[PDB]
């Protein structure tokens with residue numbers, strides 16, 4: 025065991041790494057993207073946030089991988105006469121990792137061919153002809169903005185979504201679920217991912233989000249609480 | 258806080274209440290229903306953890322949040338069909354078994370308030386109340402699930418269940434996944450535990466096999482873990 | 489892992505096994521011993537255990553569980569009276585029934601039956617025959633004659649905070665007590681081999697007695713308890 | 721709740737802040753002080769902290785966190801040499817840099833700056849000016865002059881198992897230590913008001929030093945550590 029666990033019911037920037045537009049509000053909410061002052065989601069916003077202590081996801085000397093689980097509550101709000109864009113994602117990234125492309129890339133990817141050593145679970149609110157399925161989806165991305173697998177997600181605007189993602193070392197099973205307590209709806213997706221193959225032994229852990237790059241496609245991307253836990257060996 | 262938590266990676270009958278055909282194998286598997294190596298017909302078995310759990314408090318008016326997880330394995334013999342199902346249930350303390358088959362051992366079809374809440378894994382259609390397909394369903398005092406979801410039963414594969422109840426939102430959420438098939442199903446609805454359940458309940462499983470020859474399955478739990486936090 | 493954990497910040501009799509005078513008050517306090525007019529009854533004996541048996545060790549795997557528990561008790565002696573006889577946390581055989589009163593804390597006999605009992609006592613009365621001269625915290629293994637002890641400065645009516653822990657690897661049993669009000673603290677530690685004395689499964693809880701003679705009585709109350717055991 | 725918990729059964733420098741001679745060995749042991757031969761270097765000073773700041777209290781809600789930590793350390797003195805200077809677990813301000821060597825354990829100055837530091841020391845050397853006569857475990861609050869202490873029978877080369885806990889309600893700080901090999905144990909407890917001395921956020925870890933004179937040196941190694949804090 026080489027355990028870690030934390031749980032923030034209110035955020036503070038002192039134990040967080042914030043990149044670009046990410047910020048913690050006076051009410052302790054992690055706000056991944058900008059407001060344009062009219063209280064409106066800024067266009068072309070990109071923000072990432074990670075927990076400040078690196079986590080060891082696997083060990084090359086023992087050949088072991090960690091199991092983990094995380095849960096968070098997010099709220100995405102689209103202003104009137106506008107559409108959702110571009111999405112939000114929880115990600116496991118390399119330690120000094122810097123932001124990538126805006127919009128459809130969720131700040132996590134490039135469309136170039138660099139190995140990003142990134143794994144993420146996205147909550148995609150906008151269709152990208154080139155790789156996205158037709159409907160808003162939850163998706164497991166492994167080194168590409170082209171989800172290795174997905175599930176239809178019925179985006180409800182302004183309602184709090186409760187996510188629960190888990191990875192089991194033995195079965196290599198990654199499983200993401202989401203539920204709208206207000207609507208009583210729920211969605212789940214699961215596929216096997218081999219963390220050792222794509223991820224470095226140590227990674228920073230957190231969120232990434234972007235708003236559409238064109239006028240009428242913007243949404244707020246806020247996380248209200250988060251809890252992570254990882255057990256290695 | 259008035260917490261409880263346990264986790265059995267292997268069962269033993271000393272801290273379990275077994276009813277009817279329930280039993281723990283030499284390998285530590287909770288086997289809810291009977292068998293010469295073939296699932297017995299008309300089998301009924303229930304098993305609960307021996308210490309009652311306080312689900313809610315009338316004096317403080319509070320309800321507990323909880324979560325449980327278990328791995329079960331249902332196996333249908335060749336040239337036979339699945340029947341009747343398996344359910345995780347919260348039941349009154351001295352609760353005794355009810356009807357066989359389609360009632361999963363939990364209900365009657367009479368009008369007694371059973372003060373029972375359960376999440377069923379139904380493997381057989383019962384014209385009178387079941388949906389057409391095999392489903393995961395949330396039952397609140399009735400074998401007629403208050404809500405359900407299509408479940409693609411895979412025979413002999415281990416299913417990993419995760420049920421959770423959140424006191425604040427009253428949200429009950431059941432999910433299942435076949436690590437082998439990489440499939441997953443989820444259901445969620447609001448249940449008010451205070452309304453139907455007594456403050457203290459025994460916690461566990463119930464299962465039955467079909468009452469007619471060709472409808473039988475084994476109903477085995479391989480591991481279980483429960484957790485409840487009151488106040 | 490074959491874990492268990494619980495934590496009662498207020499007792500209720502539904503998940504407890506009460507023996508003799510043990511009882512839970514309307515305020516949810518486990519009261520191990522009686523009253524007669526609101527004064528600790530003489531010759532009282534009360535035991536209380538958590539209702540689900542705990543597996544302390546496994547003969548097939550040869551493993552032993554590590555555990556920890558913590559509770560807050562309060563012993564109060566009435567005016568012009570002396571403390572007696574004591575309170576103890578014990579690991580006992582599953583259907584175990586009470587033993588002798590007074591100095592035996594309800595856990596022992598003075599006969600030579602193997603009681604398969606292990607307990608940590610909080611002794612408030614000197615028993616010439618086996619007790620040390622001063623009030624002590626003691627580790628008892630199958631005998632009311634503690635295998636080891638430490639001076640305990642009993643403060644009357646103040647809440648004591650106990651913390652007992654057993655580590656499988658080192659076989660180290662360690663008991664400590666602190667009076668948050670007085671800022672005092674006491675600790676004892678010795679190695680005990682649970683496999684040698686205890687059965688694989690045991691009931692877990694408390695036992696307490698009041699002196700058998702008029703002016704030796706105290707109340708024996710537990711206010712909160714928390715147990716945790718991890719096997720393998 | 722704004723919880724945190726971690727547990728390292730083997731150290732790696734990637735989630736640690738190391739200062740001066742602190743280093744993680746190939747075997748994953750946090751070695752707070754240097755060597756040379758393989759002898760403890762004289763005048764060594766090393767500090768190590770967990771990389772994410774912990775919030776110890778909140779000015780807006782006025783709440784303080786309860787916490788607990790446990791670690792196993794091993795201090796070894798070379799033949800024909802004496803222990804010096806000590807080891808300490810400390811809660812320090814976030815960017816905090818090292819202080820004086822030897823007797824100051826790297827945590828203090830002897831000047832009159834508020835160090836906003838709270839530490840539990842395992843002092844192996846008497847310092848006429850402020851130390852008690854015997855080797856002690858002590859609670860330091862802003863000064864190398866422990867606010868309270870307890871005799872500690874240092875056993876050379878044996879693994880010591882420490883357990884420190886802080887309870888927000890009672891403000892009680894309680895440190896204990898046991899040598900599973902010797903079966904000895906020691907405990908100290910006093911009330912400390914974290915809000916009064918500590919900033920809301922602090923880095924958490926260890927500090928240690930070796931004697932500044934030839935014959936006074938020891939190794940200062942931590943073999944495992946686990947911290948836990950619950951705020952509100």
Ligand SMILES: *[C@@H]1O[C@H](CO)[C@@H](O)[C@H](O)[C@H]1NC(C)=O
Pocket residue numbers: 035036037038048049050051052920
């Ligand atoms: C986080 O805590 C620091 C403590 O100095 C405070 O200045 C800051 O305002 C807090 N941040 C938020 C978003 O409340």
Ligand SMILES: *[C@@H]1O[C@H](CO)[C@@H](O)[C@H](O)[C@H]1NC(C)=O
Pocket residue numbers: 268269270271281282283284285688689
């Ligand atoms: C239950 O534990 C007892 C301990 O004595 C053991 O004899 C028995 O074999 C165990 N039962 C099972 C089904 O493993």
Ligand SMILES: *[C@@H]1O[C@H](CO)[C@@H](O)[C@H](O)[C@H]1NC(C)=O
Pocket residue numbers: 456499500501502512513514515516
């Ligand atoms: C225990 O809970 C039951 C719930 O029905 C209640 O009637 C009883 O008063 C409780 N006992 C105590 C001692 O509080």
Ligand SMILES: *[C@@H]1O[C@H](CO)[C@@H](O)[C@H](O)[C@H]1NC(C)=O
Pocket residue numbers: 225731732733734744745746747748
């Ligand atoms: C810490 O992990 C890194 C991962 O790159 C490895 O190089 C290093 O050897 C590890 N340190 C120890 C002391 O094992």
Ligand SMILES: [Ca+2]
Pocket residue numbers: 110111128148149150151152156
């Ligand atoms: Ca998209």
Ligand SMILES: [Ca+2]
Pocket residue numbers: 341342359379380381382383387
């Ligand atoms: Ca049915």
Ligand SMILES: [Ca+2]
Pocket residue numbers: 573574591611612613614615619
């Ligand atoms: Ca005595």
Ligand SMILES: [Ca+2]
Pocket residue numbers: 805806823843844845846847851
């Ligand atoms: Ca000194």
Ligand SMILES: [Mn+2]
Pocket residue numbers: 146148155156157161163169171
């Ligand atoms: Mn997508």
Ligand SMILES: [Mn+2]
Pocket residue numbers: 377379386387388394400402
């Ligand atoms: Mn049904």
Ligand SMILES: [Mn+2]
Pocket residue numbers: 609611619620624626632634
């Ligand atoms: Mn004694």
Ligand SMILES: [Mn+2]
Pocket residue numbers: 841843851852856858864866
């Ligand atoms: Mn000192």
